[PDB]
Amino acid sequence: ACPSGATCGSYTVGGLGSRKQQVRNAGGSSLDLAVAMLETERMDTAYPYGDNKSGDAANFGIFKQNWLMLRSACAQFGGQGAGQYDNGAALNSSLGQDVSCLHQSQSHYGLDAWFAGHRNGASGLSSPNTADIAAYKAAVYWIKAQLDADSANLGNDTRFWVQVPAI
């Protein structure tokens, strides 16, 4: 059943199973798969460039990591400024680098703080215990529970989803 009042469900996405297997082979855990699953249908980067944001808010890669976090945590982007955000687009064509950056970012911030910045950027890092951040985290963990409960879900075409507001 759906997490705390939210609307949720599942459906089939052609080719998604093979893509899940590629993400796992690139080092993605079930948590990583859950984040990717929440962010795009096909675990890809065909969403609009930067997800229509610029600077520190721009999103890159299959997890929609933001440039603030990438430049703060990932060695690939060390020392870079907000205005250099176009450099994050390297993650759009390298799954291995995308996963490496995700892991570096999660380790840099710790996972609970990582969720806050992933959801809400600099504002989230400074106010990480909001209701909206908690709802995002709950959505990810609900998806993860579906993946964890049946290993077929790690390789099949099923996408689990939870409705969260776009911000």
Ligand SMILES: OC[C@H]1O[C@@H](O[C@H]2[C@H](O)[C@H](O)[C@H](O[C@H]3[C@H](O)[C@H](O)[C@@H](O)O[C@@H]3CO)O[C@@H]2CO)[C@@H](O)[C@@H](O)[C@@H]1O
């Ligand atoms: O620090 C720069 C800027 O960040 C602002 O927060 C944004 C983040 O940087 C991300 O862009 C974040 O995107 C996530 C949201 O969950 C989206 O709904 C989703 O589509 O993509 C990602 C991953 O889930 O969005 C926030 C909000 O726009 C904000 O903190 C701002 O004050 C700050 O200057």
Ligand SMILES: [Cl-]
């Ligand atoms: Cl991020």
Ligand SMILES: [Cl-]
């Ligand atoms: Cl807070």
